[PDB]
Each structure stands twice: as C-alpha cells, then as structure tokens.
C-alpha cells in the first residue's frame, strides 16, 4: 500500500490525498479507512467505508474511489488539519489489514 510521502495545501484550499495498492486496484471491497495523527497523540478515525463520517468529524472531510486508488478530499483546509494521514486497506487473500505509509499535509 503506497501513499504519497508529503503534500501541501494553502489555507481555504482543496487537497486530495491518495491511497493505492502496489500491484492491484482499490475498490469498495477493500473498505478504505483514513486516520489523522498528530505526534504523538493516538490516531483519530476520519473516514471509513469511503464515505462515512463519524460524529464529531468536520463535514469538509470526504472520501471516494478515484479509479484504482482511494482518495481523501479536504475542502477548505484549516490550520488544525496539518497532521499525518494514514489509509487502512483490507486485503482478503491473506486476510490482513494494511496501513499506508502516511502523508504529511502542510497547510500554507
């Protein structure tokens, strides 16, 4: 599972993070879940099942499948959105849950 190492967005802008497999396609059957972590606080669940927002999550966090790759979109990024974002993918052939590398978002 490959994520972009780091990307940056401006205040009030829109950024789209990406999660993808090394040798396959990301579908809704992989149940992508996104997590936000500020070192060294515990990870916080952001988006699960590609479109579900837990209570307390700001409405600006949205997800979708953008092809063979999972995508998390932040519309109107604020200063508190500067953190590390991880993607959990579910693989069924070995029955495992795989975390992504992690992407550092820099709000400018």
């Amino acid at each position: 599972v490959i994520q972009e190492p780091a990307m940056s967005v401006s205040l009030g802008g829109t950024v789209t993070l990406t999660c993808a497999f090394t040798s396959g396609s990301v579908t809704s059957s992989n149940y992508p879940s996104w997590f936000q972590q500020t070192p060294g606080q515990p990870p916080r669940l952001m988006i699960y099942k590609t479109n579900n927002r837990p209570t307390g999550v700001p409405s600006r966090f949205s997800g979708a499948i953008s092809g063979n790759k999972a995508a998390l979109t932040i519309t109107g990024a604020q200063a508190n959105d500067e953190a590390d974002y991880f993607c959990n993918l579910y693989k069924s052939s070995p029955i495992a849950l795989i975390f992504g590398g992690g992407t550092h978002l820099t709000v400018l």
Binding site: P42, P43, L45, Y48, P54, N88, A96, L97, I98, G102
Partner: protein, 124 residues
C-alpha cells in the same frame, strides 16, 4: 468510553512481554480488539486482532508465530503476549476497538476508539 494499555518497558532481546488493554465505558464482549504499533519515526503497523468470544485470531506476517492474542471478557481486558522480541519491535503499542453494530461484529469493523499507548523498548 476509554481504553488504557499497560505492560511494556525495557526488555532484553529475545525476552517476553505481556501487554494489557482494559476498556471502560462500553461492553467489552461486543467488539473486536486490535493491536497497532508505531515505530519512533515510522508509520503504523497492524499486528493482531481477536473476536468477541476469542474464537477467531488474526496476525500479520511480521509477528506470526511470535505474538499471541487473548481476551478476558469478565475482567474487561485484552492481552498481547510477545515472544522472541527483537530490537525491531521497539515501538509505541496502541489498542483499537472496532465500531461494531448491535446485530453483527466483523473483522473489518472500523477502529474508532484508540488508546494512549505503551512504549516498548528492546535493548541490552
């Protein structure tokens, strides 16, 4: 709702260690329990999971054969037995509950409630 992890500390390479995870504020026998570690500077790594009754146990390939996951629903605690520890196991170990519906619990339940974590150091 709260998950608190115990155990951990300095362990000689090749030793053993048992990590506990006590949950409060929710019924512990109605959700999956997951163990995730984060190395000092690296990303998260899923380790193991256990069913509500403990019948089903899943492990990652990195720690298969060394780690054993158990559960004590009466005491509201879940255990992670670490064996044959190497210096590459030095990480902060979190415990994550799966958001389980009332009528069904599955291995792919989202990890919504985490814990502060415990730091495990394997060194001589």
């Amino acid at each position: 709702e709260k998950l608190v992890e115990s155990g951990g500390g300095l362990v000689q390479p090749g030793g053993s260690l048992r990590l506990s995870c006590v949950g409060s504020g929710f019924t512990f026998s109605s959700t999956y329990i997951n163990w995730v570690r984060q190395a000092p500077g690296k990303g998260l790594e899923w380790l193991a999971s256990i069913s509500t009754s403990g019948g089903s146990t899943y492990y990652a390939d990195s720690v298969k054969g060394r780690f054993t996951i158990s559960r004590d629903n009466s005491q509201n605690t879940a255990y992670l037995q670490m064996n044959s520890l190497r210096t590459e196991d030095t990480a902060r170990y979190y415990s994550a509950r799966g958001r389980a519906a009332l009528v069904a619990t599955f291995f792919t339940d989202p990890m919504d409630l985490w814990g502060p974590g415990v730091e495990v150091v394997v060194s001589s």
